[PDB]
Structure 1
Amino acid sequence: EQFHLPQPFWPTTKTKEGEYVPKDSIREASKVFIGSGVLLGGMHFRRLMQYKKGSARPGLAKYLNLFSLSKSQLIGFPVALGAFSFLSHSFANLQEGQTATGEFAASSIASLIGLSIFRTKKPLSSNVAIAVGMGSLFGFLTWAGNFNLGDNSYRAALEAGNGNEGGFDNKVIKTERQGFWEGVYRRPLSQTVEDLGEGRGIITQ
Structure 2
Amino acid sequence: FHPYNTLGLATQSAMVGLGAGVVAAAARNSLALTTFSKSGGVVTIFTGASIAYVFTYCSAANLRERKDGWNHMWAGAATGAVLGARTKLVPAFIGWTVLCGAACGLFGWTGARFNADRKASLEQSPKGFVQEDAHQTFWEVVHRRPLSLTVEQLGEGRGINAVPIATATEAP
TM-score by length of 1: 0.64
Aligned pair 1:178/2:136, yes or no? yes
Q: Does 1:75 align with 2:22?
A: no
The answer (yes or no) to whether the contact 1:101–1:139 under 8 Å persists in 2 is yes
Paired residue total: 156
Task: State the one-letter code of the partner of 2:58.
Answer: H
Residue type at the aligned position of 2:150: T
1:34/1:191 CA distance change after superposition, 3 Å: same
Rounded Cα–Cα distance in structure 1 between residues aligned with 2:153 and 2:25? 58
Q: 1:30 to 1:184 in 2, by over 3 A?
A: same
Which whole-Å CA distance do the structure 1 matches of 2:107 and 2:156 have between them? 36
Query: Contact 2:83–2:96 (CA<8 Å) still a contact in 1?
Result: no
Cα distance change on mapping 1:112 and 1:168 into 2, 3 Å? closer
- 1:85 Cα offset (Å): 0.8
Between the aligned partners of 1:189 and 1:84, the Cα distance in structure 2 is 44
Q: Shift in Å at residue 30 of structure 1?
A: 1.3
Q: CA deviation at 1:187?
A: 1.9
Aligned partners of 1:168 and 1:185 also within 8 Å: no
Work out the CA distance in 2 between the residues paired with 1:129 and 1:183: 42
Q: How far off is 1:153 after superposition?
A: 0.9
Is 1:100–1:142's contact at 8 Å kept on the other side of the alignment?
A: yes
Q: Do the aligned partners of residues 196 and 75 (structure 1) sit closer, same or farther apart at CA in structure 2, a change above 3 Å counting?
A: closer
CA drift of 1:42 comes to 5.0
Query: Cα RMSD over matched residues?
Result: 2.6
Provide TM-score, normalisation by structure 2.
0.75
Match of 1:196 in 2: 154
* Structure 2, gaps ≥5 residues long: 33-37, 167-172
Offset, 1:104? 0.6
Higher relative contact order (CA 8 A, sep 6+): 1
